[PDB]
Amino acid sequence: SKLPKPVQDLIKMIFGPIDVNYEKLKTDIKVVDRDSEEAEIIRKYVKNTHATTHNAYDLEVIDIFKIEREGECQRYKPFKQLHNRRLLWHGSRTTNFAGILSQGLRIAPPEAPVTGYMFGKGIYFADMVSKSANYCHTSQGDPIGLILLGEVALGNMYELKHASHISKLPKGKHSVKGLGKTTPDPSANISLDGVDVPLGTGISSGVNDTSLLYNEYIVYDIAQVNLKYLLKLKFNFK
Ligand SMILES: NC(=O)c1cccc([C@@H]2O[C@H](COP(=O)(O)OP(=O)(O)OC[C@H]3O[C@@H](n4cnc5c(N)ncnc54)[C@H](O)[C@@H]3O)[C@@H](O)[C@H]2O)c1
Ligand SMILES: Nc1ncnc2c1ncn2[C@@H]1O[C@H](COP(=O)(O)OP(=O)(O)OC[C@H]2O[C@@H](O)[C@H](O)[C@@H]2O)[C@@H](O)[C@H]1O
């Protein structure tokens, strides 16, 4: 394999031939350097947004991966122009990343239960690492988890305080944002490339009348997601 050792781990991690399996992902997986601009931001994002609720463990960033799904740059071209784009977390089970890298992040299928969603069927993201990380489903005897950072064309956010069984958006709206109580400090954000990164520490949002602890982000068109990084986390339980 003409690949770094960290990558080959990632290959075996998902599946279960290496280079045959790498093509099946249809994704260019480069390892980001630990002493770089990206890494110093990405690992700071993970440090700051580790929330007070989710103290059952502390995180440790093992390997970062710059990812580039095939054809995803061209599919995202319309939404590239749209304003308000954030780099947001999306945790998932390690089993699923085979399908995700190959087919992208997709909407939950027509059959799946519609009762068990906050803001209808869409694609969920968080500005807190600890909220998304929960959906890696790492256990004591399986404490290594994969988490996505994605460029998400939010656009005009329909900012709600309480779950709503949405189908169609208001006109002009492109995303839905669930307003949470505790938020990454807005005035401590930075811009990596043409993207907002909400890497502030957790503070009160000033939003009184909402049920959500943390913010969440939903998009209903699968072309509004551009995957950027695919971290490898270590859950250090207490
Ligand atoms: N999971 C999060 O990062 C997350 C972020 C913020 C907030 C939340 C909160 O969790 C609630 C549930 O969200 P859940 O992640 O289960 O998403 P849901 O829509 O129910 O389930 C679909 C799953 O299918 C995965 N997938 C997508 N494409 C593919 C593919 N090609 N191959 C294989 N798997 C694929 C996708 O990643 C997700 O795990 C939600 O209501 C919300 O309150 C989660
Ligand atoms: N009225 C609601 N309808 C549907 N889903 C809801 C509702 N209120 C909350 N949820 C969902 O429950 C979760 C709560 O979101 P946050 O307030 O940000 O809290 P979270 O970070 O997810 O941690 C609390 C979560 O873990 C457990 O304690 C508990 O099961 C709870 O869902 C999210 O998945 C959110 O979409």
The per-residue DSSP string of 27-68 comes to: B--EEPPSSSHHHHHHHHHHHHT--SS--SEEEEEEE-EE--
Angstrom distance (rounded) from CA 188 to CA 207: 18
Q: Which residues pair with 203 in a beta bridge?
A: 183
Angstrom distance (rounded) from CA 145 to CA 25: 18
> Is 90 annotated as contributing to ligand binding?
yes
Residues across the chain? 238
The experimental method behind these coordinates is X-ray
**Collapsing DSSP states into helix, strand and coil, what is residue 75?**
helix
Topology of domain 1-238, CATH: Phosphoenolpyruvate Carboxykinase; domain 3 (3.90.228)
Look up residue 108 and give its DSSP letter.
Answer: P
For ligand 1, say whether the CB of 90 is within 6 Å of any of its atoms: yes
Which burial class, exposed, middle or buried, applies to 16 when counting CB atoms under 10 A from its CB (0-12, 13-18, 19+)? exposed
Domain boundaries, the chain: 1-238
Instruction: Using the Cα atoms of residue 14, residue 137, residue 238 and residue 60 in order, give the sign of their dihedral.
Output: positive
Resolution in A: 3.0
Q: Is 216 a catalytic residue?
A: yes
Sheet holding 123-125, edge to edge: 123-125, 216-219, 175-178, 157-160
For ligand 1, say whether the CB of 216 is within 6 Å of any of its atoms: yes
Ligand 2 mutation target, pool 131, 164, 181, most atoms within 8 A of CB: 131
For ligand 2, say whether the CB of 166 is within 6 Å of any of its atoms: no
Give which of 19, 111, 112, 73 is closest to 227, Cα–Cα: 73
The C-alpha angle with vertex 218 and arms to 129 and 110, in degrees rounded to 5, equals: 115
- Which two three-digit tokens encode residue 81? 């122009």
How many C-beta atoms surround the C-beta of residue 38 within 10 A? 16
> Is 178 annotated as contributing to ligand binding?
no
CB neighbours of 36 closer than 8 A, spacing ≥ 6? none
Give which of 117, 95, 78, 68 is closest to 218, Cα–Cα: 117
Instruction: Tell me the ligand closest to 207's alpha carbon.
Output: 2
